[PDB]
């Protein structure tokens, strides 16, 4: 049986890490 | 030994984190590694017991 725990909300970050 | 017992553990091309056992022939015992969830090779066991039974 699996459990879950919240980690983040879904958002685009204007200063996310570049680059892929 | 079977020969697959002598092959290094294989995480594979998926990004889950599933702890498994492999047989480490140099150490002469089973150790843990991270399996990714897809494309498992044969040196990959859910338990130390089962790992030692087939590769020990």
């Amino acid at each position: 049986d699996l459990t879950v725990e919240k980690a983040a909300d879904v958002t685009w970050e204007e200063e996310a890490e570049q680059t892929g | 030994r079977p020969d697959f017992c002598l092959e290094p553990p294989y995480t594979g091309p998926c990004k889950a984190r599933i702890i498994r056992y492999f047989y480490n022939a140099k150490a002469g015992l089973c150790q843990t590694f991270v399996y990714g969830g897809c494309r498992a090779k044969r040196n990959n066991f859910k338990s130390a017991e089962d790992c030692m039974r087939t590769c020990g």
């Binding site: 049986d1 879950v4 879904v10 | 889950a16």
Partner: protein
């Protein structure tokens, strides 16, 4: 379709991104990641292999599963409707075990098939990140990260795993 479809427990989770944890060797560890949206919890099939999720004293069974698509949803059918558009940058909300979530921006390439085209993410996150959402600039999930290939030079490339919303 059938006259009296069976019923599973509802995924009573706030919307957002979740670590999925499994009891295994050494105890409880993060096996992957999932996305709760519109009352449905979405992840990659290889993460859970269709195992029951437990939360709030309830046992959650998968409502839809496809090994072929490597996707699975709990509480209802697939709700992630956004599609990646070729030439547009995405972010991955990478949720690595033991680490704070972090967004990474990238321009996807493509995987070629006789079927059609699937986006390709050349980013290499730690094991346990499978199910991390790939998102567009609107904050919509275009797919999930973690089913990929290791390239000849040891680089990792993930597919953008997606299916049509129900």
């Amino acid at each position: 379709d059938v006259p009296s479809p069976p019923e599973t427990q509802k995924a009573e989770l706030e919307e957002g991104v979740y670590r999925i944890k499994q009891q295994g060797i050494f105890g409880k560890t993060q096996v992957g990641v999932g996305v709760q949206k519109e009352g449905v919890f979405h992840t990659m099939w290889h993460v859970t292999r269709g195992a029951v999720l437990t939360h709030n004293g309830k046992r959650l069974e998968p409502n839809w599963a496809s090994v072929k698509k490597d996707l699975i949803s709990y509480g209802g059918g697939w709700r992630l409707s956004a599609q990646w558009q070729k030439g547009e940058e995405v972010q991955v909300i990478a949720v690595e075990p033991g680490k704070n979530p972090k967004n990474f921006q990238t321009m996807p390439g493509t995987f070629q098939t006789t079927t059609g085209e699937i986006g390709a993410i050349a980013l290499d996150f730690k094991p346990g990140t499978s199910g991390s959402p790939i998102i567009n600039r609107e904050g919509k999930v275009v797919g999930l990260y973690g089913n990929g290939v290791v390239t000849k030079n040891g680089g990792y490339v993930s597919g953008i795993a997606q299916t049509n919303a129900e």
